[PDB]
Every structure is written in C-alpha cells, then in structure tokens.
Amino acid sequence: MRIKKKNTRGNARNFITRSQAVRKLQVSLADFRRLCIFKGIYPREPRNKKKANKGSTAPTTFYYAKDIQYLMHEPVLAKFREHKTFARKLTRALGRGEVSSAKRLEENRDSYTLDHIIKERYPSFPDAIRDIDDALNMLFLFSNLPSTNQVSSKIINDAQKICNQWLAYVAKERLVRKVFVSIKGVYYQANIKGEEVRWLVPFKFPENIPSDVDFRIMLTFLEFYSTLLHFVLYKLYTDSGLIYPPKLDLKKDKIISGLSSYILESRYDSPVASLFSAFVFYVSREVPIDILEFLILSCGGNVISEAAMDSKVTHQIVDRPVLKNKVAGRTYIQPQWIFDCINKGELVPANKYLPGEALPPHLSPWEEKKLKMIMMSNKQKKLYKKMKYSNAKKEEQAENLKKKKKQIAKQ
Template sequence: MAKIKKKGTSGQAKNYITRTQAVRKLQISLPDFRRLCIFKGIYPREPRNKKKASKTSTPNTTFYYTKDIQYLLHEPLLNKFRDQKALAKKIARSLGRGEVSDASRLEKNHAPKLTLDHVIKERYPTFVDALRDLDDALSLLFLFATLPSTNHVPPKTIALCQRLCHEFQHYLIVTNSLRKSFLSIKGIYYQATIQGQDIMWLVPYRFVQRVNGDVDYRIMATFVDFYTTLLGFVNFRLYSTIGLRYPPKFDTRSDENGAELAAFTLEGRAVGETPKALEASKLQTNGSSKEISREVQDKVDKVIKTAGLNQTKDEQTAETTEESTDAIDRFEPAAPEADTLPQPDMSGNEAGSLFAPFTFYVSREAPKAPLEFILRSFGCKRIGWDAVLGDGAFTHDETDSRITHQIVDRPQLPESSLPAIPAAKDDGAAPKVKPGTRIPGRTYVQPQWIWDCVNEGKLLRADLYAPGATLPPHLSPWVKPTRGGYDPRATLAEQEEEGEAEEAAEGGDSDEEMEDEAPEAQKAVDASDKSEDESVDGGMDVAGTDDDESDSEDEDEDEEKDFNGLEENEATSESEDEDEAARTQHQKELEAEAAGLPFSSSGATDEASKKKSSQSKKLAAKKRKEDEELERQKMMMSRKKRKLLEKMMYSNKKQSDEAAKLRSKRRKLEKGAQE
C-alpha cells in the first residue's frame, strides 16, 4: 500500500508562504521585514489557487515564495536589524532609569550602520542592469530633492538627493546625453541615452509642497536609502568612464546662494575634451582595422592598375561610404504605403551644437533650473539671469550686448500699466531694465521654444513663440501619429475622410432643425408603440398563426422586390426628392413675394443643395456596397477568423470615432476663430 501523503506538504502549499509565517521564520518585526524585502527586491506573489496555497480559510492573505524567504535567512542585514532592536531596548532601559546621558551615548556611538553595497552588487551584476533600473530611482530622488524638510523627511536626506541629482545632471551636460523632454501636468519628463540605454524620469515642478499625513514616508524613505546607494554607484562609474574625478568639488557657500549646478566643479580631463575622450575608445578599436584595410586597398589598387582596369567608380563609392558612415543612418520605408520606421535619435555632436552659438538670458518669471539644465545639455555655454535667481550666471546684466536670446514668460502689457524703473545704485550692480521693454537685436521667445527645438532636433521659427503669441501645441515626443488616428500637426484636409467635411457642414446647418423635430418625432414614436401594443391580444405575440406566416411571406416578397429593383427604387426616390425640392422652392418664392422681398439666391442655393444631396447619396450608396461586400467576405470565413476580424474592426472603429470627435472639435474652433 502506498504511503499516504499529508496535506500541505507539496504543491502550492509548499511553494508559497504567508507573510505571518515569513516574519516568524525570520524572527524580525514587520517594519524590518518590509525594509528587507525592499532592499532585496522581493515582492508578494499571487498563487493560482489560494485555497490550496493557504492552510487557513482567511481570504485576504499575502503570499511570498518559500524560496525567497529561505534566501533571506542568510542575509547579513538581519544581524544589523537584531542589533538595532537590542540597542533600542538598552536606550529604553536607560531612559526609564533617567540616565539621559547614557542613552544619548548609546545612540551616538553604538548605533549599527547599514551598508547596502553588497545588495547593489547582488541585484545588478552588470552595469547595464543598473542603468535599466534607473528610471524609478531618478524619479523618486528628484521628488525628494524638492520636498521641504519635516519630521518625516530630514534635511540630510534632501541634501543628499539634491547632490546626487546634480552630479547626474553634470554627466549628462558634459556628454550631451540628453535627448528629449516634455512639459506635462505631472512635471517635466526627461529622456537620456547612456551607453545605448534609454532612461526616462519625471521631475516635479518647483511649487510649494504640502506634506500630508496620508503618505507612508517610512516605506518611501526605505526606497530612498536604496536608490541613493544605487545612484552613487552609477555616478562613480559614469564619471570614471569619461576620466572625471568623483565626487566633484562642491562649494557649500555658492549652493546656499542658489547656484545649484554651478556649485560643482568638475576635475580630471579637460571638460571640453570629454566628448573626444568618449570617441577615443572607438578610434582605438577601429584604428588598427582601418590601417590594415588601407594597406590591403593599396595593394589591390596596384594590381588593378597593372591589369589596366578602371577603378574610378569603385573609389567614388568607397569615398561615399566612408563619408556616409560619419552620420547616423536614416531608415526610409520601401513603399509609400508601408509603415513608418522608427528613426534613430540625434548624436551627441548634433545635440552639443544645437544652442552652442547663442547666449541666453532667463527672465525672473521663467523657470531657471530646468532651462539651465536643458540649455547646457545642448551646448549652450553662456546663460545669464537676474541676481535674484542665484549665483552661477554668465552675466546678471540684462542689457549685455552679447545676449542673443531672452526667455520671457510674461504677457504683453501696455506701457501705462508697467511699473517705474527703480533708481540705479552706485554699488556696481547691473542696471535695471523696465519690464516689457525690448532691446533691439535680441530674440525674445517663450520657454516652450526651447523644449520644441530639443524634441525636433533643430531650431524652429522664433516668431511663433514670441511673448504674448498663441503657442503651437506642445506634443509629446514619444507619441507618434498612427494611421487612422488624429494628428494635431497635420491640417484637417489631410486627415478628413471622404465626404466628412460635407457631412459636417450639413450637420451644422441642420442641428437646430433636428432639435425642433426631435420632440415631435418622439411623440409620434410613442403613439405608434402604444397602438401596436393595444392591437395585440394581451400585448403578446402568438407563434404559428396564419397572420404571422402571411406577414413573413409578404416581407420576403418585399425583400426580393427591393433586392431585384434596387436601381428602380433609387431612381424613384431621386425623382421624389426633386419634386419635393421644387415644391419647397415654389413655397419660398411665394413667401418672399408676399413679404415684398427679392428672391434672387434661390437658384444658387438650390443647385448647392442638389449637389450636396447627390454627393451624400453617392457616399451612402458606396458605403452600402462596401458593407455588403464585407458581409459576403465574412460569410466565407471560419468562425475563429470572423471573430478576430470583428475585434479588429471594433478597435479600428473606436479609434476612428475618437479621431473624428477631435477633428470635429478642431473644426468648430477654426470656424469660431474665422468668425
């Protein structure tokens, strides 16, 4: 007889363990268990069958993999947590005895320090793995860098987050790794490309933050501890790859004066030669192969010349290929109706030369921190701002003749409403300029011009972004227009379907008429429904009666007549419509004659209405034929393919309906602007 297998010793009951059992097995508190799981990257799991996985009948149970908990048993951090617990007992005992000095001494000298270096090495065996997991880290650290200091968020944590974020920004500035940015409601999105990995993070706007008690800052502080260690490792590796010393020099006094990025001083190689240092490794690997290929090419050329062959065409093609390899390849579709292939981003050299020849001045109302970061990332070396915004500017003088572009974010105001110019002081400060004045020879733009130029990879027209002008739509650079979707950059004529504009015009003219006719039509429908209900005995249909059979036969005959004589019915309907149009025209002429008004535009309006009606009928007939053809094709399909086709048609129709709604809104806006 086989051995009886006990319940809960195999299968899902063995593979999963509850949180309570895990805490008991590790012999730590629940907050320490949460911290340990966050550090090690262990998360709850959902079993397929909770009844089989749990030995109890509690429905709301959190499960973990048993192997993950077994892995935590050998974690060195467990000893640190137990030491902290023992120290907390000693401090509580000292405070209970009234020995405050002993308690402070224990907390200061004997507190165990947690180091997460080994955790980072375990979770990220390669540097590329760390770069791939950097999105959430940067978003959370930039968030904590803008929070005010409270009991939950100490100032040391905020200062550490700010320093690490500024160090990461300096690497992006030196290497020109920033590629795209987008202004959204949540904040500013940035995307950088580092060693072939696209990293995207979110930076909140610098508004006054109100820290609420709804957020559990203990869990967020645990993530901050882990992410600060991770970003410190990443910054060290990034700086060492380009030959810069880490950490960079940090001037505390200039940082207190609002210098931010300018408070750091990079040391190592010449900072201007850093992009060349990045290309040095590529040149070293490719240099030997190029020299060998040149020697081989020279030998081949000698052989060809001795043979009397012409090599001019081959030399031209070789030169063109060598020249073309310097630029980034562009992928063109093979056919005009094919899908658009994703194009590669700009290179570091192109990004570093976008704003290089310009000198910018940031006005007081514009956001200085994001503008400085983006401008420096794309090659601008000289940026000035008012002294109120902090230190580190190229110039505080707004009247400096070297300034080529000024970023303004205030509307145009009349001169009478502008305040007076403050009196100049003799302390050597920069002279004040009256707000709203324009210095000749300088281009004034709104901040959106910077972001749109960065996303497009080229300089756009500055007059479209002049102060007080209606700005073009700021679109996300990561959302590409799809076929059949709405594209706000294209005109309505390019996106509208066949006959959509005519239908919209007819619908706009007949909206008021439809609103007037709607109540009367509803009354007629209600009356007809009541009469039909009263005509049937008891309001129910009896199956199998002679009347039903005769009705069905009549309906079949009518359908056959309609199918056979479709063209005749269309011809008769067209003639009836023409007669009705003639009657309405005659009625309008009589009303105009009775009122003593001329009726001269009747012919033109009638012709236009006839053209619109004929076009709408043609479109309706074409659509009807397409629907009939589609139904015939669906009848020849299998059930599985038919269901798949219906799902595709549903999703396409939903997308087209949304695009049509957006086009109608745009059509109304343009019509209102013209009026």
C-alpha cells in the same frame, strides 16, 4: 509508498502566504517589508491559487518559497536585530538619567549598509541603469519637499545633493535627447551608457503634503535608491568623466544653490549635444531657471540670469505679455522654442515663438464578416468580440478628437 497528503506538495511548497513568510523569518511585518523593498521581492501569481493555499479560496498574497528561504541568511536582517538591541540599550541610558553613556552609545554605533544588496540585485551595470528610471523619480520628488516631523532636513539635503550631482553629469557629458513639459512636471530622456533613461522633475513650488501618504514606506525606497545612486554616480564619473565627489563653491551655493553652483573638475555623437554651441542665452526672472539652465548647459549654450544680480548675449527668454527693453542685438523667445529645439534637433524657427502671441500645440516625443462569425467556437467568439470592442473604443475616441477639433476650429 504510503498515500501522500494532498495539499502539501506542488504549489504548497512552491509558494507561501505573507503570514507564513513573516512567521518563518521571526521578523516584524514592517521589517519584513523593509527587507522586501531592499531585496526587490514581490508577491507572485500561481496558476492555481487554491492549490497554492491548503485548499482554501481566500484573499491571500503568495511569495516565492525559495525567495523568502534565501532572504533568511542575510547581513541586513542581523543588523536590524542589532538596531533593536541598540534601541533598548539607549532608552536604558536615557530613562535612568545618565546622558554621557547614551552619547557614548551613539559613538559606538555602526549601521547597516546596502552595498552587497545591489550586487545580488543588479549584478551588471547596464541592469542598474535599467532600474535608475524609477530611482530618479523618487529622489527628484524628495528634493522638492518641505521637511516635516516625518522626514528630516538631512534626508532632503542629501537627496538634493545627489539630484544636483546627476544634473551636473548629464549637463557635463551632454547626454540629453528628449524633453517634455507637462502639468505633472518636466520629463527628460537621457542616453546613459546608451540605454535611454527617463525621469520626472516637479515644478519649484511648495508642495502640499497629504496626511494620507505613508512617509515610512517612501523613506526606505529613498534609502535604497539613494545608495544605488551613489554607486551609479561613482561608476559614471570614474569611468568616463570626473573625480567623485566634486566640491561646491560656498559663495556660488549662496547665490543659486542649483546647477551653476557645484563646480566639477575632470582629472559630440548626437545632434542635440552639438546644438546651441556658440550661443549665449540671457534667462530672465519670469521663467523657472533650474528646469531650463540644465537644458542650455547640456546642449552647449551659456546662461546669465536676472537672479544672479540680486555682453555676448544673443537670445533672451521672457514670459511677459508686455516686454520693456527691446534691443536690436538680442532675439526674444518664449521657452517653448527650447522645448521644441531639443525634440526635433533641427533648430526650429523662432517666428512662432515671439513674446505676446499664442504658442504652437506642443506635441509629446511619444456584413460578410458578421456572417462568418458563426463557424467560430466560444473560445474564439469571446476573444474576437473583445478585440472588436478594443478597436471600437480606440476609433470612437479618435472620432471624438476629430469632432472636437472641428468644433474648436470654427471658433
């Protein structure tokens, strides 16, 4: 052989720069990143960064060559091109002054579907449920958003619809194990086909949208997770449960627009799913309902709200320092009791949960050696000193918790 050129072989055809990926695809950076979001493609780290370049030490991100080289032939890229053609051919109609032909161009418009993009991403159903962890976190955030000029109302209404479908199913087949109310929101854990998904729901207050965040990146994630959730929910309902999609009662959606609405027709294993059976809870006005009625209906209780007005009831959930009525028939609880009954599973006594007293701390469900240092190498001294510092920074923080507990317990 002739002397081969140096920096064109091993790591140079294994990886490519962002610029080289964009150029090779002949696609805009935005659309390159849109496809990258849909396909689940990410930058990868080579063992040599400069052999992955053509010699240069430079701030560079490396994609996998065969990954981009596999993205090139794909229906979604072709449909992006078709959207670009449609865009100019519409503004041709609009810019001239003809409205009827433009309106007709809307009628003769097909759009890209993210159907086949999931088959190649999550080939098995249990793999899709391993992703639904991050998928349900976007979607439940986007339900609790005011619609802006960035994000249309149709987007939020469809996202909220999927959210309500998810909440309805989990409360239907009784698949909750753990709850955790934090400052951030309310965490749930759910054995969905026996693999324990986790997801977060914010509190139902108006959310201050920063102008800092980019509502074009988040919209494509929503666009992928949305379709992914449609296919997941069809699979779940048509396997073990119900018809999809279920209908919604109009005068129920006028009252709550939550979870007691949206009725679903068809044609246990865990202690949590057997709890609250033959119990009827009267949720008061003061507590948030949609974060709580999900849990009651999931375990096996029943809900009658103060809100619905605007019997069999055995417990009332009230958050006031002064409670007015006080009947002999009901038992009076601050919601912390429910948030502990789900976590333990053993029905915690309501003696520490009376209205007017302070709640329990609410835990999450989640010499010679200095002389024998010497005979270690530098590649072992560096590592051992690092492990010593990592244990020290833990133990001193544990000492901080103990010292703070002692300083508070005195007061």
